[PDB]
């Protein structure tokens, strides 16, 4: 007899899969050994980033009065933020479009 | 017989349900979020591997991952990600 299994995600209080992250760290040829806390810490960081972007995109979607997030909303959320934009400067988002921006000198009057 | 694929869609949806219970997400937006998660995973893992190699450590630890987070994530993203990860690691150790 042995105790009922308790996922490492639940033990850390995370939604992201700590076991999957640990497997990917081991199989990715990143190091010979992997500490037990590394997949937990990394899963927490990935969860934070995912939550931040998804909540900003949900705010953007609500401002457009639509219920589901689309690449346009993800693009808007990422580009309207200094830190997310500088983190993802070199990245192209498919079907994301561009921010509305017209130079002042091009306007009439 | 076709093999089983693998994606972060379930976890991204669970996080979306926590941050915006009523909000949904498109399939292509889910694909972009999977790309984001994979890219950031690869960046932190590569930087932590380089840190271990520079310091001649055989192990990738939470300290290496934290240093990689501080190097990669700019500004307050670094501080909040460090806080979230430290909280998760402390809770995991306590449990």
């Amino acid at each position: 007899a042995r105790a009922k299994a308790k996922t490492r995600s639940s033990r850390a209080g995370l939604q992201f899969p700590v076991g999957r992250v640990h497997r990917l760290l081991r199989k990715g040829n990143y190091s010979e050994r992997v500490g037990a806390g590394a997949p937990v810490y990394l899963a927490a960081v990935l969860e934070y980033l995912t939550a931040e972007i998804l909540e900003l995109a949900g705010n953007a979607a609500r401002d457009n009065k639509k219920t589901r997030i689309i690449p346009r909303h993800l693009q808007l959320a990422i580009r309207n933020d200094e830190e997310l934009n500088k983190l993802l400067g070199r990245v192209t988002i498919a079907q994301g479009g561009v921010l509305p921006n017209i130079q002042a000198v091009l306007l009439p009057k | 017989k076709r093999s089983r694929k693998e994606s972060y869609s379930i976890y991204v949806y669970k996080v979306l349900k926590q941050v915006h219970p009523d909000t949904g997400i498109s399939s292509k937006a889910m694909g972009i979020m999977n790309s984001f998660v994979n890219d950031i995973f690869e960046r932190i893992a590569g930087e932590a591997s380089r840190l271990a190699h520079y310091n001649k450590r055989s192990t990738i630890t939470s300290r290496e991952i934290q240093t990689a987070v501080r190097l990669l994530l700019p500004g307050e993203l670094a501080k909040h990600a460090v806080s979230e990860g430290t909280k998760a690691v402390t809770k995991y150790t306590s449990a």
Partner: single-chain antibody, 227 residues
Framework: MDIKMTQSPSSMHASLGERVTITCKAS??????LSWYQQKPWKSPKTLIY???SLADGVPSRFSGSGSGQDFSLTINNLESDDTATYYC?????????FGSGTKLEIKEVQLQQSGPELVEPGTSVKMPCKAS????????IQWVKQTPRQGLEWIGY????????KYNEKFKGKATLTSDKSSSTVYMELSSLTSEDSAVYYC?????????????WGQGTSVTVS
């Protein structure tokens, strides 16, 4: 519809060393986006707790925050003479930010230069600068808060220097206007059609664009007096 903040204990008298607990209710769930502020008289408020549990930089472990959803609490463990100040809970989970009614307690480098006091006559306009220094100007929003002795603290709005984006409280639309100047790292607030009701102290406060980040550094305040 604006989220009502309810600090149940309006005032406490307490001796040194003993514990005090302050509570703050919410009319709607705010998902842990609540902050606590300590304001000594004739001084700008300072941040104590953010994200309902996290100690701000330089805050000793004496202060403790707890709760989520609608029930929140601030706990002080080892009182000193310096703890005599007013404590406000602030929610930022919804677009119109709302402070608490304020709780008085009696015990028995980022810089934001703000302009000095300004005497003004009704119906004209005034322009208040907020000169920020010591950090990446474009990376953080500048928040403006109005403090009257009779309504306490009121959030007016913010400007984001990165994209010149602005958001205003409905009560202050038209009354208030925000502008930024990257070259001098300065943010300007214009008040239009001054009225005797407008007599208040106005603060500019830095707040990051991160959703869990709170108003962390405050200007010394600019008192506007209407004849």
């Amino acid at each position: 519809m604006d989220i009502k903040m309810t600090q149940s204990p309006s005032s406490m008298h307490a001796s040194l060393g003993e514990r005090v607990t302050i509570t703050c209710k919410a009319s709607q769930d705010i998902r842990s986006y609540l902050s606590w502020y300590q304001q000594k008289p004739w001084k700008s408020p300072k941040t104590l707790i953010y994200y309902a549990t996290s100690l701000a930089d330089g805050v000793p472990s004496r202060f403790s925050g707890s709760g989520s959803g609608q029930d929140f609490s601030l706990t002080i463990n080892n009182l000193e003479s310096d703890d005599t100040a007013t404590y406000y809970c602030l929610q930022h989970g919804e677009s119109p930010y709302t402070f608490g009614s304020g709780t008085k307690l009696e015990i028995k480098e980022v810089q934001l230069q703000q302009s000095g006091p300004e005497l003004v006559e009704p119906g004209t306009s005034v322009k208040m600068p907020c000169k920020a220094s010591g950090y990446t100007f474009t990376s953080y929003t500048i928040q403006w808060v109005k403090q009257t002795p009779r309504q306490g603290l009121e959030w007016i709005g913010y400007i984001y220097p990165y994209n010149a984006g602005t958001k205003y409280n409905e009560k202050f639309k038209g009354k208030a206007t925000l502008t930024s100047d990257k070259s001098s790292s300065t943010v300007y607030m214009e008040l239009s059609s001054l009225t005797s009701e407008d007599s208040a102290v106005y603060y500019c406060a830095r707040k990051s664009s991160r959703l869990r980040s709170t108003l962390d550094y405050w200007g010394q305040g600019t008192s506007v007096t209407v004849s």
